[PDB]
Amino acid sequence: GLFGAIAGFIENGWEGLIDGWYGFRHQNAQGEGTAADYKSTQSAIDQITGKLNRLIEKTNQQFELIDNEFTEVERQIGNVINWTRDSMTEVWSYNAELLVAMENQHTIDLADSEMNKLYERVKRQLRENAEEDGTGCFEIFHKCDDDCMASIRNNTYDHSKYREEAIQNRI
């Protein structure tokens, strides 16, 4: 919810979009087409994986029995051992739940961030030839074909080729 994109002004996600986290759905003269972005999907996924590799770490740290399950140790030292072990249980349990909640907050906002980085980039590409409607869409103010879409996607679309055309077409 941090950036406003996911579960914000984009209304929802697309259950038909198998091949990515982020992608494109277009409507023009020819037809309607969908394809997921690689460059930003990879980007998020890679940050998730980089989180995992950090926690799925194995402690190289060994512990031995100070205790005895078969013949109980003397009772006073028994009581200090148990009190220490439980205190460690408190600390670690708090650490576990805090660590996980925080990673989760950050993961979610990591996703919001990358969406709202796809958006703002495409916006930047198109300069003055289209408009923010505000549901995560750009109304294009010039006719455009399916090889024009692809040039937006893989980031080659030239603006000053369609500038005048689309500009009078906003009055």
Epitope: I18, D19, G20, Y38, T41, Q42, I45, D46, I48, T49, L52, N53
Partner: nanobody
């Protein structure tokens, strides 16, 4: 530079199951899709399915659905393929291969060394 290292040759009796492993060494493959592709003796490459474990996808070729299990342990950087109810039609070399990205469309650019499975009495 990641290498994929597969488990060793298997000799199996008809009806048994075989589970082959593919370990990613020199780096993780968890952010990519890995496919399993088999090659029957004298025959061509044949896709079995794949997995992209962080992405959260497991896919199967229709011709092997229900008979094959593809899985992954992200923590050991290992992918697995288990094929059940083996017959001689399943004698083949089995390869794991990593795609250029998290899904199965991209060309497969990293390959394991292969694991021979022989189904014989």
């Amino acid at each position: 530079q990641v290498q994929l290292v597969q488990s060793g040759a298997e000799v199996k009796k008809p009806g048994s199951s075989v589970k082959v492993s593919c370990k990613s060494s020199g780096g993780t493959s968890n952010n990519y899709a890995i496919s399993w592709v088999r090659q029957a003796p004298g025959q061509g490459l044949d896709w079995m399915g794949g997995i992209s474990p962080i992405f959260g996808s497991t896919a199967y070729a229709q011709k092997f659905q229900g008979r094959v299990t593809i899985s992954a342990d992200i923590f050991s950087n290992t992918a697995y393929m288990e094929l059940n109810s083996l017959t001689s039609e399943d004698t083949a070399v089995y390869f794991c291969a990593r795609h250029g990205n998290y899904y199965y469309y991209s060309g497969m650019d990293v390959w394991g060394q292969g694991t021979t499975v022989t189904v014989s009495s």
